[PDB]
Structures are given as structure tokens and as C-alpha cells.
RNA sequence: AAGUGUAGUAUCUGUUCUUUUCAGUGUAACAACUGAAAUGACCUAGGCUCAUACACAUUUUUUGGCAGGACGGGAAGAGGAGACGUCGCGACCCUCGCAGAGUCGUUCUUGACUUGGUCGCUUGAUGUUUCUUCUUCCCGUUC
């Protein structure tokens, strides 16, 4: 149920396809540094036993409410958050060099809830929010661009200077 | 741990001849 | 009034008893007796189960080596910029599809034989290589 180190030790640990490295988390449930899939992760915690060797984190298909409780992980480049219930984002996330975030199919409602993504310095190049209610709200794309200009590709679409300028105009 | 100081018819089945290995072919 | 010895028998009761094998004696077969000693691993009582000279003299390791305050972005205003390459955001474009690839011998899967590219960046990222900062506003850390 809980993400605990006993679970941290023994999931299917291997190397991504992309050759991204990691060591996974499954004594009986939810995982980390690879395939954190399908074990009903309520709250992220106990990332310390990850002890840094992980490029990627496939959190998908859990019951995560928010994204806090991230120990300092220099190595983590990619977070695959899909199919959870992320309502909010922490803010002091700042895991330096988090290049990719996958928020697909979650429950982030408001633009303002997206604000904490601006904190990601210049590393968050790829962000995908598609599948959230916030996407339907007006001027969603432009607000994400003006809020986090660090993003190079949003919703698998590329930013482009045209809508950068429109984001400036509004 | 806890070493504190202070201060059935065996011969009968052989006698009767049973429980001895044998085989009918 | 009581009473002995030779041979032999029966019957109580007390007492003893396997960690496992192997081989010999013994036995009608047992029993009994005589000798030795496996230890380790694995599978669901069992096992054709398993085991007990040199690396300093040209291509490598004995070498050609040595020499309120601070920070960090991003923007504006005043007094970092040229080549030459190498991998990326977009596209008015190109192009249009299932397969390391292509063929054969033998068998239900192997052995042989041959042989993104272009344009922008409308302020993408990077190593030669020559020359010559201040002020203001915003957002993060620290005290």
C-alpha cells in the first residue's frame, strides 16, 4: 500500500529501452526507478532508498494525489505520472535536471495549480498535461507557455515563437 | 540465551517377524 | 519336634532396547554377534544426480611527461562579436509505407553465401581559435 523501502529493494529493476538506468521498488506494491505501475501508490515517500541511481520513474496507474515528498535526486530526468489523480504540484520540487514530466490523465483543474512548474529552472523541456480538466479551460496553451517558457514541447506539440509572442500579448 | 548461574513394540515386531523388508513379485 | 546331597526342570518378578547404513559370522529366515562410518548441494518416499617460467627496450601495465545583505536566471536602457565545423524547435517541403536486409538447404526453427536530406531560429545546443562593465524591475536559495 505505502511506498516503503522494503518495497524499494526488489521490483523488476532494469534499464529503460532508452538505456535510462534505474532500480525498481516492489516487495508487494508501488515502485520507483523504473515501473511504479499498478500498486495503488497514495503518497510518494521514502525516495531516499532510491539513493539516486535512476534516470526515470514510471509512476503510472497509481492513486497519487499530489507530487511532493521528493528527496533530492540529481539523476532523475523523466517522470511518467500517467493515470493517477494529481490535483496539485508541490512547488519546491526543484529536482535539478528534471527534463520530462508526464501528467497525462490526471485531475489538475486550475491554471494556478500549474504555476509550480515554472520553478523547474531550464530543464523541464517536455511536459504533457493532456487528459486533464485544465486543458479545456480557455487560453490553456498560452498560459502554460507564458508561465513556464522553459518548456520546448507541450502536449507533444512544439512551442513556437508565434504563440510565444501571443502569450506575451496576453 | 538462558544459561544463568546462581549467587513402539520395537523388539516385539522383530520377535514376531514384522516390519522387515520383503516384496511379492 | 525339625533338618540332607547329587544332577536337572519349570515358573514369577526385577533389569536391558534401535541415529542410520554397509560387509562378515550366524540363523530355517530371523534374531544375535563381529568390524567401519560422510560431508556438502538440489528437486516432488524417491535420484542410470553431482563433488571431495614469465607480464621495465618501439603497438597496450612499469609512462615523453611536467608546466536588510549575497548568489544565480530572464528582460530593458547606456558606454560580447567574426570563422570552421558537429547534433537539435518549426515547415510552405520532400517523400508514402510492417518490416540490418536479400536469396537457398533442411525441418517446425536454424547453417551457408553476398552487400531524416534541405531551408529558417523570428534572438536552438556545443568544442577549437584570435582580438577587446554599470543601473532598474521580477522570480528562486541562504543568513
Curated annotation (Swiss-Prot), chain A:
Domain LRRCT, residue spans: 132-170
Which sections of the protein are LRR repeats?
Answer: 53-74, 75-95, 97-118
Q: Where in the cell is it found?
A: Nucleus
**Keywords annotated in UniProt:** Leucine-rich repeat, mRNA processing, mRNA splicing, Nucleus, Repeat, Spliceosome
Gene Ontology MF, one: U2 snRNA binding
One GO term (biological process): mRNA splicing, via spliceosome
Cellular component terms, GO, for this chain's entry? cytoplasm; nucleus; Prp19 complex; spliceosomal complex; U2 snRNP; U2-type prespliceosome
Cysteines engaged in disulfide bonds, as pairs: none
Please give the function described in this protein's UniProt entry: Involved in pre-mRNA splicing. Associates to U2 snRNA in a MSL1 dependent manner and is required for normal accumulation of U2 snRNA. Required for the spliceosome assembly and the efficient addition of U2 snRNP onto the pre-mRNA.
Q: Assembly state and interactors?
A: Belongs to the CWC complex (or CEF1-associated complex), a spliceosome sub-complex reminiscent of a late-stage spliceosome composed of the U2, U5 and U6 snRNAs and at least BUD13, BUD31, BRR2, CDC40, CEF1, CLF1, CUS1, CWC2, CWC15, CWC21, CWC22, CWC23, CWC24, CWC25, CWC27, ECM2, HSH155, IST3, ISY1, LEA1, MSL1, NTC20, PRP8, PRP9, PRP11, PRP19, PRP21, PRP22, PRP45, PRP46, SLU7, SMB1, SMD1, SMD2, SMD3, SMX2, SMX3, SNT309, SNU114, SPP2, SYF1, SYF2, RSE1 and YJU2. Interacts with MSL1.
The entry's family comment says: Belongs to the U2 small nuclear ribonucleoprotein A family.
Q: What else is known?
A: Present with 3630 molecules/cell in log phase SD medium.
**Any idea what this protein is called?**
U2 small nuclear ribonucleoprotein A'
Q: Which organism is it from?
A: Saccharomyces cerevisiae (strain ATCC 204508 / S288c) (Baker's yeast)
* Full protein stretch here: 1 to 170 of 238
UniProtKB/Swiss-Prot annotation, chain B:
Family listed: Belongs to the SF3A3 family.
Q: How does it assemble?
A: Belongs to the CWC complex (or CEF1-associated complex), a spliceosome sub-complex reminiscent of a late-stage spliceosome composed of the U2, U5 and U6 snRNAs and at least BUD13, BUD31, BRR2, CDC40, CEF1, CLF1, CUS1, CWC2, CWC15, CWC21, CWC22, CWC23, CWC24, CWC25, CWC27, ECM2, HSH155, IST3, ISY1, LEA1, MSL1, NTC20, PRP8, PRP9, PRP11, PRP19, PRP21, PRP22, PRP45, PRP46, SLU7, SMB1, SMD1, SMD2, SMD3, SMX2, SMX3, SNT309, SNU114, SPP2, SYF1, SYF2, RSE1 and YJU2.
Query: Know the name of this protein?
Result: Pre-mRNA-splicing factor PRP9
**What are the subcellular locations of this protein?**
Nucleus
Miscellaneous section = Present with 3920 molecules/cell in log phase SD medium.
**Free-text function comment from the UniProt entry:** mRNA splicing factors, PRP9, PRP11, and PRP21, are necessary for binding of the U2 snRNP to the pre-mRNA in an early step of spliceosome assembly.
Amino acid at each position: 500500500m505505502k511506498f516503503t523501502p522494503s518495497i524499494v529493494i526488489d521490483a523488476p529493476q532494469y534499464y529503460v529501452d532508452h538505456f535510462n538506468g534505474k532500480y525498481n521498488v516492489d516487495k508487494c506494491v508501488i515502485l520507483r526507478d523504473l515501473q511504479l505501475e499498478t500498486d495503488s501508490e497514495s503518497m510518494p515517500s521514502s525516495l531516499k532508498h532510491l539513493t539516486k541511481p535512476t534516470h526515470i520513474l514510471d509512476l503510472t496507474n497509481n492513486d497519487l494525489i499530489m507530487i511532493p515528498d521528493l528527496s533530492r535526486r540529481d539523476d532523475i530526468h523523466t517522470l511518467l505520472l500517467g493515470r493517477n489523480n494529481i490535483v496539485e504540484v508541490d512547488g519546491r520540487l526543484l529536482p535539478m535536471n528534471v527534463q520530462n514530466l508526464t501528467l497525462s490523465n490526471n485531475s489538475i483543474r486550475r491554471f494556478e495549480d500549474l504555476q509550480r512548474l515554472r520553478r523547474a529552472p531550464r530543464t523541464l523541456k517536455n511536459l504533457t498535461l493532456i487528459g486533464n480538466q485544465v486543458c479545456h479551460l480557455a487560453n490553456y496553451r498560452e498560459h502554460v507557455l507564458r508561465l513556464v517558457p522553459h518548456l520546448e514541447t507541450l502536449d507533444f506539440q512544439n512551442v513556437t515563437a508565434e504563440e510565444r509572442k501571443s502569450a506575451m500579448s496576453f | 540465551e538462558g544459561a544463568e548461574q546462581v549467587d513402539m513394540p520395537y523388539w516385539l515386531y522383530k520377535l514376531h517377524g514384522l516390519d522387515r523388508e520383503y516384496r511379492c513379485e
